[PDB]
Amino acid sequence: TVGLTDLKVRLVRDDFADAVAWVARSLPSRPTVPVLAGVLLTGSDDGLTISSFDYEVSAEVQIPAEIAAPGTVLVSGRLLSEITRALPNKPVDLSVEGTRVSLTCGSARFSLPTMAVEDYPALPELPAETGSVPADLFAEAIGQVAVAAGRDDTLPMLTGIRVEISGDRMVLAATDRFRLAVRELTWTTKTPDVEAAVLVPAKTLAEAAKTGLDGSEVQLALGAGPSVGQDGLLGIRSEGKRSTTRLLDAEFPKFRQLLPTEHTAMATIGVGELTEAIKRVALVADRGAQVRMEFADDVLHLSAGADDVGRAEEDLPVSFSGEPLTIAFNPGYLTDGLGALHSERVTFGFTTPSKPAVLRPATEADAALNGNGPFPAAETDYVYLLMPVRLPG
Amino acid sequence: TVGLTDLKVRLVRDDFADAVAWVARSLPSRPTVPVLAGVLLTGSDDGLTISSFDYEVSAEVQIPAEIAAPGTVLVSGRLLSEITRALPNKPVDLSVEGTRVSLTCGSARFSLPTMAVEDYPALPELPAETGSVPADLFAEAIGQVAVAAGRDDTLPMLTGIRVEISGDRMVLAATDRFRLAVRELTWTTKTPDVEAAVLVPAKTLAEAAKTGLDGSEVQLALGAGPSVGQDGLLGIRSEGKRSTTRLLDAEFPKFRQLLPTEHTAMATIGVGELTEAIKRVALVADRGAQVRMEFADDVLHLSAGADDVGRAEEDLPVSFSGEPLTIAFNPGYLTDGLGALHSERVTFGFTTPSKPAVLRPATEADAALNGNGPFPAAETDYVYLLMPVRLPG
Numbered sequence: 142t143v144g145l146t147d148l149k150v151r152l153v154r155d156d157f158a159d160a161v162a163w164v165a166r167s168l169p170s171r172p173t174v175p176v177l178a179g180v181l182l183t184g185s186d187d188g189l190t191i192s193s194f195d196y197e198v199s200a201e202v203q204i205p206a207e208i209a210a211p212g213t214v215l216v217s218g219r220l221l222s223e224i225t226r227a228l229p230n231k232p233v234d235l236s237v238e239g240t241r242v243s244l245t246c247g248s249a250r251f252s253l254p255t256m257a258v259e260d261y262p263a264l265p266e267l268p269a270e271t272g273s274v275p276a277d278l279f280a281e282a283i284g285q286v287a288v289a290a291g292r293d294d295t296l297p298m299l300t301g302i303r304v305e306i307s308g309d310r311m312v313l314a315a316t317d318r319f320r321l322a323v324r325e326l327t328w329t330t331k332t333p334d335v336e337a338a339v340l341v342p343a344k345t346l347a348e349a350a351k352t353g354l355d356g357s358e359v360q361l362a363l364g365a366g367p368s369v370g371q372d373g374l375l376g377i378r379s380e381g382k383r384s385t386t387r388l389l390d391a392e393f394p395k396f397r398q399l400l401p402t403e404h405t406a407m408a409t410i411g412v413g414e415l416t417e418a419i420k421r422v423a424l425v426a427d428r429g430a431q432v433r434m435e436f437a438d439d440v441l442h443l444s445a446g447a448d449d450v451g452r453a454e455e456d457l458p459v460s461f462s463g464e465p466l467t468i469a470f471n472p473g474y475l476t477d478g479l480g481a482l483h484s485e486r487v488t489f490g491f492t493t494p495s496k497p498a499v500l501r502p503a504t505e506a507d508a509a510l511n512g513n514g515p516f517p518a519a520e521t522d523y524v525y526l527l528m529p530v531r532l533p534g
Numbered sequence: 535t536v537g538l539t540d541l542k543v544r545l546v547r548d549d550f551a552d553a554v555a556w557v558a559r560s561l562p563s564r565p566t567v568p569v570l571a572g573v574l575l576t577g578s579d580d581g582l583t584i585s586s587f588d589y590e591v592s593a594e595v596q597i598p599a600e601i602a603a604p605g606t607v608l609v610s611g612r613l614l615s616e617i618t619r620a621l622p623n624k625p626v627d628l629s630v631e632g633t634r635v636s637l638t639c640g641s642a643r644f645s646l647p648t649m650a651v652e653d654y655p656a657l658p659e660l661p662a663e664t665g666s667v668p669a670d671l672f673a674e675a676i677g678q679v680a681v682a683a684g685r686d687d688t689l690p691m692l693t694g695i696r697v698e699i700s701g702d703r704m705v706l707a708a709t710d711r712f713r714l715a716v717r718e719l720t721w722t723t724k725t726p727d728v729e730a731a732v733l734v735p736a737k738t739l740a741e742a743a744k745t746g747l748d749g750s751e752v753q754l755a756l757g758a759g760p761s762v763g764q765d766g767l768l769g770i771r772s773e774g775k776r777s778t779t780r781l782l783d784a785e786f787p788k789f790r791q792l793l794p795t796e797h798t799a800m801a802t803i804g805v806g807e808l809t810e811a812i813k814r815v816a817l818v819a820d821r822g823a824q825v826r827m828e829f830a831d832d833v834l835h836l837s838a839g840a841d842d843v844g845r846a847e848e849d850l851p852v853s854f855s856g857e858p859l860t861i862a863f864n865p866g867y868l869t870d871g872l873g874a875l876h877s878e879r880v881t882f883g884f885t886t887p888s889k890p891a892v893l894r895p896a897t898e899a900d901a902a903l904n905g906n907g908p909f910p911a912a913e914t915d916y917v918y919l920l921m922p923v924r925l926p927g
Contacts, residue, residue: 220817220818220843220844223817224814224817224818224846227813227814227817228814248848248849248850249811249814249815249846249847249848250846250847250848251818251844251845251846252839252844252845252846253818253844254842254843254844418642420620421617421620421621421642422642424613424616424617424620425613425617425644425646446645449647450613450647451613451644451645451646451647452644452645453617453642453643453644453645454642454643455641455642455643456641457641
């Protein structure tokens, strides 16, 4: 709450820099309201609360700090971040001089102008906790799904990652219209028979996955009972670094219907070698490119390029089964999926050279797979559905 | 010379990739004549000559290669570079199919279109050798001087580095109008009493310093006797990688006159600590910045910034001597010089807070320097003359 006192605090660099860092990354890029570019520093009760709010993304962290006089100060976020990033490891003194915010440290001294906290907005209080998730695994999931998230703000449906809860099983899924990534993940709920679904901004969720899921556990807050998701914001708290994200109004397109049941052809090949081959063959093509995969008798004839700029073709061995095939994909999307599998060997589920193709981690179940087909699809944890492209004609 | 035969050659990746690399970096960025974007591959006498010419920069290298049929082929330089950069370590087959240039390697095969070598220009034959220089030391010099080279093609005088020869002593010097870097370097001449001076494009010379002076010695070819420099081009050969650079018509401004004789004040301080302090204090200022250095009683009060965006100040110890001082410089240029010294301790020669300041490596001769002054200037190997800036008023 507002403090009539002028702040006066002592901190340690490491803590202050880490906090100002994680809070600075969550800042926007100088938006309409200049005040939003500022960072809030609320010193009280032996702790310094560093906060930032974007009317969409909230970031807050508290630090142990020897308080000499409480207070609240708003200061340029980017400038604070750079300075703190350049401070020596010596402890940091921080006082207020009316309209200035003196920051002393060793032999260096800084004097930043105080931004009008009077105009600064509030900081949304996070919703009621809904459950807990493992950090590294959760971040891995967000990373695997966000790969196929739409990055055009003119199509909000794709701009987000759908987070679904159903007991101790949640489902993350995003799509860019051509690629559709899905990932099941088991967690812990505080509402036993909770079932809900929400669309989170992919950029912000991925942003938190890179720098927020730093602890051993990550708390997810959406609500309680019938109010799960009703709050309209998603809270994420880990290691005292708690952040908020306003949800997307648009609803996610029905995606489960798009997942094939049976696969006409199936291929299994090493991720690394395939990726290298795809990049190699792609270098010939220009920006607008196309990787052609001709599956025949456990051999993949990976061709591409045109007769004007040049054409490339590389032959690789493959554990193939089913009817032969000649299917074309986008090199970028294909590389994206292969890189998101986080597996040592990839399995492709092909239906039609014009219908979508499944990319999922290989399983020893698929190793014992030979016949004419069709073949049932496996229930892998992560699946990447890529829409192929047209062939020369 | 033109070969009626269609080329057919076998090489090893490492050699071919290194050659195509060094020759590709010397290429322009798709200039007026598309043919210039191509790379020349002349296979003859057990060797493949990879060449490229920009009507200004020439790059040529020869590789050992099993020739099955000689020939000459022109192919897209960037495409060749990327492909060769992505080839496996297996040997590389290279044949010509009329209008195509098939390149086989292991399981991968490429087919690039042949560019019209009929329109390709000649490759300037290098001038008569003038002498030899140590590689690492020569590159170090070019790097130390090029730091202060003008990068605006609308002022050719600054666009180059002046290379002067006088026996076994050469002098490299460049200037950007505000910073003026000079470097003396001893080499070996083939024309005993040779004396000449030339202006080389700084971008191209630095380009060669990063990737051309790779051997133990670097040969410099300008001419012989009175024809030294008359050729109009500079040849540089090392480890069979020989390159040419067309000289600049504009003449270098008289710079020796600008070097002060006596210094009113002198400072000696560690490079690292000073650099850190300058960057720290600079973060407060915006793009258009200014580092203020107040030298007083072996203490440097390094302040900067304005009362609107903020102001910083850091106090450092210094081995100072002479009249006190308060001088301002540009943070970028100052950092550039300090980084170009390649020394552990820097010595500043100050004359007037408005006149240029000298930055040169510190010497134990300066360690025994105390008095009112003036002080004579030392004849260091490298000197960086920085023009200060105006103070608030």
